[PDB]
Amino acid sequence: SMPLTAYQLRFCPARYIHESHLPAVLLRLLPALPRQSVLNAWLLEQLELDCAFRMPAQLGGLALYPQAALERTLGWLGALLHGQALRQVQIGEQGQRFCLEQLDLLIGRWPPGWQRALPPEEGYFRRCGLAFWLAACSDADCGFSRRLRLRLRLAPADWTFDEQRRSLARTLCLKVARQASDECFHL
Ligand SMILES: [Cl-]
Numbered sequence: 001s002m003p004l005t006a007y008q009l010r011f012c013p014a015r016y017i018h019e020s021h022l023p024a025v026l027l028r029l030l031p032a033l034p035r036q037s038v039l040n041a042w043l044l045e046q047l048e049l050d051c052a053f054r055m056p057a058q059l060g061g062l063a064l065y066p067q068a069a070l071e072r073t074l075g076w077l078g079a080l081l082h083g084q085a086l087r088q089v090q091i092g093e094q095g096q097r098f099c100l101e102q103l104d105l106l107i108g109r110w111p112p113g114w115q116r117a118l119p120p121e122e123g124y125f126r127r128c129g130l131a132f133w134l135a136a137c138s139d140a141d142c143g144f145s146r147r148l149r150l151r152l153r154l155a156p157a158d159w160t161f162d163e164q165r166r167s168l169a170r171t172l173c174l175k176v177a178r179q180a181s182d183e184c185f186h187l
Pocket residue numbers: 091092093094095
């Protein structure tokens with residue numbers, strides 16, 4: 001249940017990167033070597049991962065969650081963004097219920113493009129919620145955003161928030177998170 005530290009987030013990308021993202025050769029080279037200082041540095045190089053980067057204000061910096069809470073928080077969020085589509089037809093009972101019951105008890109009316117239609121590959125909602133999370137902290141340095149993205153495997157025009165909607169997106173994010181895992185909401 002242990003979180004990551006700013007140091008490990010800034011300098012130890014191999015502590016939290018998903019094998020999905022390793023450069024092919026290193027994936028191929030990966031088979032040995034069970035979190036090692038040279039790979040951390042070599043990963044920061046192969047990807048221009050600026051170690052000069054600010055953590056998005058007010059807890060946007062969820063790049064430090066334990067993986068489990070991270071995947072839960074973003075899954076609940078991606079599900080919620082498909083709430084309406086889902087009323088018209090279960091990754092955690094707690095989360096299934098959250099999406100159906102709280103859809104209209106969170107941010108009032110749903111801004112015009114926030115709710116989306118359904119098609120779904122595996123992990124689809126986690127990626128949706130992650131896309132939404134980054135869009136809510138949009139000034140995020142390529143160093144922050146690129147590192148959060150690395151914690152999951154493999155955005156709609158109406159999510160380029162340019163107004164009060166951005167301030168409403170941050171609020172939805174924080175509320176979904178406050179319920180999706182209270183354990184690690186202190187971040
Ligand atoms: Cl659950």
